[PDB]
Amino acid sequence: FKLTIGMGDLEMLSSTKYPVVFIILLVTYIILTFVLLLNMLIALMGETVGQVSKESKHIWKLQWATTILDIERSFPVFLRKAFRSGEMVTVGKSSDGTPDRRWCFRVDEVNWSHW
Amino acid sequence: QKILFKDLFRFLLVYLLFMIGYASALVSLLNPDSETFSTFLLDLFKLTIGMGDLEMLSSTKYPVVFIILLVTYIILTFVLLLNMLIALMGETVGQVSKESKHIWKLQWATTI
Amino acid sequence: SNGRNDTIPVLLDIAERTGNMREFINSPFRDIYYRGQTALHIAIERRCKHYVELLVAQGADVHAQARGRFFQPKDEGGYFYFGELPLSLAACTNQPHIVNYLTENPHKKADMRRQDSRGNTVLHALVAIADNTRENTKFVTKMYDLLLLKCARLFPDSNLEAVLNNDGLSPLMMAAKTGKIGIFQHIIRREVTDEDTRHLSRKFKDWAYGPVYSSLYDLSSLDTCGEEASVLEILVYNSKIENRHEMLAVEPINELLRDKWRKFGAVSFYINVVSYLCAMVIFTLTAYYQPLEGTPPYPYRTTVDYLRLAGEVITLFTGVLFFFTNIKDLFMKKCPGVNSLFIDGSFQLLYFIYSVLVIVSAALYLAGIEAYLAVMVFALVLGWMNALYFTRGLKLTGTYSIMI
Amino acid sequence: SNGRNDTIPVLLDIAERTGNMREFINSPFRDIYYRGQTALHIAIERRCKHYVELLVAQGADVHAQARGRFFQPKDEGGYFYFGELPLSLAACTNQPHIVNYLTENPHKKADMRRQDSRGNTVLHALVAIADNTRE
Ligand SMILES: Cc1nc(C)c(-c2csc(Nc3ccc(C(=O)N4[C@@H]5CC[C@H]4CN(c4ncc(C(F)(F)F)cn4)C5)cn3)n2)s1
C-alpha cells in the first residue's frame, strides 16, 4: 500500500533478489491501478450522465412523491381530512334525486381551438 | 463563472459539511483544549494534501478505526472532486451546447 | 369446417331424445390442464355466434368457470387468463355481439356482476388482458365502457366498478398496480355525456368563460386519506418499475401531488430539514464535550454534565424515533430489491444502520468503558453523510447526492 | 337552450312597459368576483350575434367595463383578461362578425380607440391574450 501511494524505499525493492521482475511487476501494478481508476471514470462521466438525463429525473419524481405520501401517512386520519385536497363540489341528482356530493378536483385549461 | 460562483457555493457547502463533521468527530475522540482543536484541524488539511505524520496518526489508541476513517475521508474528498467534474460534464450538455450562443448574443447586444 | 359443423344440431337432437340433453350440453374437461372448460367456452372462443346461440338455447350453463391450468395468468404457469367465465371470455376476445347476446337473451342471462374463483369481474378480467399497445387498448376501453354502461342501465342501484375482488382491488386500482396505462388513463378521464347514466363519470365540466375551460376530475378513490386504499399510494409503491414514471403523469395525478406539496407537503419537508440539522449540531456538541478521562457512566454534578446528559438523551430519543419509523416502514411494505432500492431503500438502510449504531453505543455506555467513543464517532461519521437525504427539495442537489 | 332563450324579448317588453328598460339592460354585477360585467358581456361571450344585436338596439352601454376580479390577468389572481370592454371582449374571443356589428351599427358604435382602466386599447388586449401557439 505504501508503494501504491507513491512513497517507498528503493532498498527493499532489490533486497531479496530478482530485481528486474520486481520492477516490471510493480510498474504494471501502478499501471493497473491507474486503469482501474479510469475504469470508474469512464462509466462515471459518460454512462452515469446518460442515465442522469432521464432516469435521474424519473427517480427524483418518485423520491419527491414518496416523501409527500409518507408525510401524509404519518399524520392522523382527522388531520389528513382537514388537509384534504380538492373541493366539495356537488355534481347532480342521483337515481333517487339526491345530490352526488363528491370530492372532486378542479383543473383549469385554456383552449382556443374548439368553440 | 458558473464554476466560480454558481456551483462553488454548493460545492463549498458540501465540502465544509463533510470537513467539519469529520474533523469534529476526530478531535472529539482524541485526548490531550481549544489549541489542540486547531492543531488537529490544520493537521486534517495537511493529511488531505498528502504530507502527513505517522506518529500522530496512532497517537491516541484506536489505530484501525482512525486509519479506516482517514482513508474514507480522503476517498470522500476525491469523490467530491469527481462529483464536481461529473456535475460540470454531461448534465449541462443539453443546456450549454445550445445556450452558449444565446448568452453570447445577449451579452453582445447588451454591450452594444 | 368453414365455421359450421352440421352434425352438432343432430347430435344434440339425439342427446335430447336419449334423455341427457342438459347432461350433454355442459360436459367439463377433467384433466388438470383444461379443467372447467365446457362446449360453451369453445363456441365463444371460436367466434361462432350462431353455435353459441343454439347451444345456450337448450340450457348451457353461462357461468361455468374454465379454471384449468391453461386458463391462468402468464405469471402463474398459463397461456390465457380471460376471467374464468363465458361472459368474461366473450368480452376478452373482442366480441361485442356475443356479449350483447349473452347479457340480453330470453333463455338465460349471465349477469355482468358475477365474479370468478379469483373474484375478478368482467371489468377486472378486461383490465387483466389489456396491454399497453394502442390497438389492444382501442377495443379494451370500448368494451369496458360498453359493459359498464350496460350494467348501469340494467342495474341502476349499484355500480359495476365498485365491486372488489378477493384481493380487495377494483378495475382502476388493478390497472394502476398492474401497469396498464392505456385503460388507467381512460378510466380516470372518462366522461359519460348521456344523461341517463352520467353519474359514473370521473371528469365533469364545471364552467366555461370564453377560451377558459374548467374541467374538474374525480379523486373519490385517488385520495381518500387512508380509508379505501387510495390509488396514489398503490401507484407510487405497488406499481411495476417500468411504467410507474409515466403512469404517475396522468392529468389529475401530477396536479394532486403538486397541490399536496403546496398545501402541507412543501414546508413539512423543510421543518424536517431544520429539526434534523438542529439535532445533529446538538449531537456534535455532545460529542465534543464528552470527557476523555473516566469510565462511563460519569458522575453528573455540574451544569456542563447536565447539558451533556440532555444532549445524550435527546440523541437517544431521535435515534429510537428513527428506528421506530424505519421498523414501521419495513413492516408496512415488503422488502424491495433491484430497481427499487435506489429510490429510497438504500437511504432508510443507512438510517437503520444509524439507529443501530446509536442503540449499540447506548448499550456500551450502560456497561462498557471502552469503544464507546469509537462507535459514537462512527455514528456521527455516518450521520453527516445522511444529510444528502434532504437534497430532493432542490433541483440539482438531489442528483448531486444521488450520484454520490 | 340550444342557443336561444325565448324569454328575452318578453322581458325587454315588460321592462319598457314598466319604465326601467334602460335600467334593466345594463345591470352591472355587484360582487367583488364579477364586478362590472353586464348582460352585453354575457351575450358577447355566449357567441350569440342575434342577442347582442337585439340587446344593443335599445341602448345597451357598449362601453361598460368588466373590471371584476375574475376579469384580471392571470398574474393578479384572475382567469381571463380581455381588455375590460365589450369590443375588446368580442375581439378577444375570435368573433369578427360581432366586432363588425359593434363597430358599424346605426344604434351605438364603440370606437376602437377607447381605453379601459388599465389604458389598454383593443390592440393591447388582443396582444395580451395572444399565445405563442400557431392556432
Ligand atoms: C421521507 C419521510 N418519511 C417520514 C415518516 C417523514 C415524516 C412524517 S412526519 C414528518 N414531520 C412533520 C410532522 C407534522 C408537522 C406539522 O405539524 N404540520 C405540517 C402540516 C400541518 C402542520 C403545519 N405545517 C404546515 N402548515 C400550513 C402550510 C401552508 F402554508 F401550506 F398552508 C404548510 N405546512 C406542516 C411538520 N413536520 N416527517 S418524511
Author numbering:
A (entry chain D): 674 to 788
B (entry chain C): 607 to 638, 662 to 741
C (entry chain D): 203 to 606
D (entry chain C): 203 to 337
Give sentences copied directly from the paper behind this entry.
Transient Receptor Potential Cation Channel Subfamily V Member 4 (TRPV4) is a ubiquitously expressed, nonselective, Ca2+‐permeable cation channel that belongs to the TRP family. TRPV4 is widely expressed across different tissues, such as the skin, vascular tissue, nervous system, lungs, kidneys, and bones, and contributes to diverse functions. This polymodal protein can be activated not only by environmental stimuli, including temperature, hypoosmotic conditions, and mechanical stress, but also by endogenous agonists such as anandamide and arachidonic acid. TRPV4 is involved in various physiological processes, such as osmoregulation, inflammation, nociception, and temperature sensation, and plays a vital role in human health. Dysfunction of the TRPV4 channel is implicated in various diseases, including skeletal dysplasias; neuromuscular disorders, such as Charcot‐Marie‐Tooth disease; cardiovascular diseases like hypertension; and respiratory disorders, including pulmonary edema, osteoarthritis, and renal disorders.
